[PDB]
Amino acid sequence: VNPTVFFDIAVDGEPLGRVSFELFADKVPKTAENFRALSTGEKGFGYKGSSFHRIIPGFMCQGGDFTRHNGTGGKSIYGEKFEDENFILKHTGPGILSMANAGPNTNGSQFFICTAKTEWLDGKHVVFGKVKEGMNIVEAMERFGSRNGKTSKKITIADCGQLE
Amino acid sequence: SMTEYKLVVVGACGVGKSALTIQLIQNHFVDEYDPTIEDSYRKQVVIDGETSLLDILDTAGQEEYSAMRDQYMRTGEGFLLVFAINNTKSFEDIHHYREQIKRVKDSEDVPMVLVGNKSDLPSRTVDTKQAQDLARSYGIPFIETSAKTRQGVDDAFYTLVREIRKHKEK
Numbered sequence: 001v002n003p004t005v006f007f008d009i010a011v012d013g014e015p016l017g018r019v020s021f022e023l024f025a026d027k028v029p030k031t032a033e034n035f036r037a038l039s040t041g042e043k044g045f046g047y048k049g050s051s052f053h054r055i056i057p058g059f060m061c062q063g064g065d066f067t068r069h070n071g072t073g074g075k076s077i078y079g080e081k082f083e084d085e086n087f088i089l090k091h092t093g094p095g096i097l098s099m100a101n102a103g104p105n106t107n108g109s110q111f112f113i114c115t116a117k118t119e120w121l122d123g124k125h126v127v128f129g130k131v132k133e134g135m136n137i138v139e140a141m142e143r144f145g146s147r148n149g150k151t152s153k154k155i156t157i158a159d160c161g162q163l164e
Numbered sequence: 165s166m167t168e169y170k171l172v173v174v175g176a177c178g179v180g181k182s183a184l185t186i187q188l189i190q191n192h193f194v195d196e197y198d199p200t201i202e203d204s205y206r207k208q209v210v211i212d213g214e215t216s217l218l219d220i221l222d223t224a225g226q227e228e229y230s231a232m233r234d235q236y237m238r239t240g241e242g243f244l245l246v247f248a249i250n251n252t253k254s255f256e257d258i259h260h261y262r263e264q265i266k267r268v269k270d271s272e273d274v275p276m277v278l279v280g281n282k283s284d285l286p287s288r289t290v291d292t293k294q295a296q297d298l299a300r301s302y303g304i305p306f307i308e309t310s311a312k313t314r315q316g317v318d319d320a321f322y323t324l325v326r327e328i329r330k331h332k333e334k
């Protein structure tokens with residue numbers, strides 16, 4: 001099976017709920033493996049404790065900076081960055097899991113979860129997974145965002161790991 | 165009641181759009197880099213003896229999907245075109261912003277000021293003459309600034325307001 005990973009989301013430390021993701025290792029194996037390993041922490045670093053620093057309601061929730069903790073940082077399991085693996089999958093609607101980047105071939109650890117169809121990102125951001133359970137938790141996270149993405153409370157990955 | 169101007173600060177990633185704006189608004193400079201999605205500021209100023217309210221839109225250096233960029237170009241009255249004197253790509257990007265603004269506004273006569281920022285730094289890659297000649301080709305002023313030392317900061321924004329006022333006379 002494709003891997004399933006989970007995030008336990010917290011709001012100012014209080015548990016909000018669990019979001020689980022299917023990672024499309026069958027189509028995007030290198031990008032899926034990066035996110036999987038960063039979710040388990042097995043390389044000695046990863047998502048646990050990091051925050052969703054940019055939440056834009058009706059657009060997406062972005063997180064994954066566990067090095068600088070401010071939205072500028074990024075570290076993959078392959079180095080600071082890795083190339084865009086492929087653009088097979090598209091941003092088709094809510095729940096799509098895709099890589100944030102600073103341009104072509106700059107994948108690190110930052111990622112975003114779509115809360116709408118975002119077709120203008122197709123071919124620019126590598127889609128590699130989708131929310132499997134807990135989309136209502138992602139929807140609850142949007143209350144803490146704003147038009148420019150600044151969050152009103154600390155939305156964190158309190159725990160994360162691999163289910164299968 | 166006083167006149168009010170919608171100003172828009174555009175330019176590539178990291179050229180100092182926010183640092184220029186925060187220096188105008190708050191009179192301080194931060195070395196920290198906090199990338200912008202969109203921020204709005206307001207400030208009451210006196211320019212040439214005329215008191216006015218400036219509505220300043222600080223934009224992202226990275227383009228998203230244009231339809232919302234066309235939005236603030238549609239409503240903006242004057243534009244600061246910012247590059248950094250140590251970032252040649254940011255200077256090369258300038259013509260794209262001017263082209264986009266003229267397209268949305270359907271005019272070759274839109275109030276604009278070319279801003280060469282980071283004029284305190286010793287890593288310069290863009291000659292002043294290059295920027296002066298570019299500004300001449302566009303018929304707009306060129307102002308050299310440093311958000312760090314505050315050099316030219318008021319001048320850049322106030323000159324933009326003067327350009328809007330002059331455009332309104334025609």
Ligand SMILES: *SCCCC(=O)N[C@H](C(=O)N[C@@H](Cc1cccc(O)c1)C(=O)N1CCC[C@@H](C(=O)OC)N1)C(C)C
Nearest residue numbers: 072100101102110112177178199200201224225226228
């Ligand atoms: S001009 C400074 C660019 C810095 C940068 O690219 N940082 C990236 C990052 O966060 N990329 C964003 C794209 C983006 C869009 C607008 C402004 C900036 O600064 C960055 C990204 O991948 N992303 C996911 C898709 C939505 C988009 C967004 O918020 O649009 C409004 N953010 C990090 C990864 C180093």
Ligand SMILES: Nc1nc2c(ncn2[C@@H]2O[C@H](COP(=O)(O)OP(=O)(O)NP(=O)(O)O)[C@@H](O)[C@H]2O)c(=O)[nH]1
Nearest residue numbers: 178179180181182183195199200225282310311312
């Ligand atoms: N030395 C020097 N550094 C400057 C100057 N203006 C900005 N900087 C620095 O350059 C970096 C980027 O500044 P910032 O204002 O965030 O640039 P921006 O154009 O708003 N970036 P973005 O498009 O992501 O919003 C920061 O480290 C800031 O301190 C300047 O005049 N001199």
Ligand SMILES: [Mg+2]
Nearest residue numbers: 181182199200
């Ligand atoms: Mg900025």
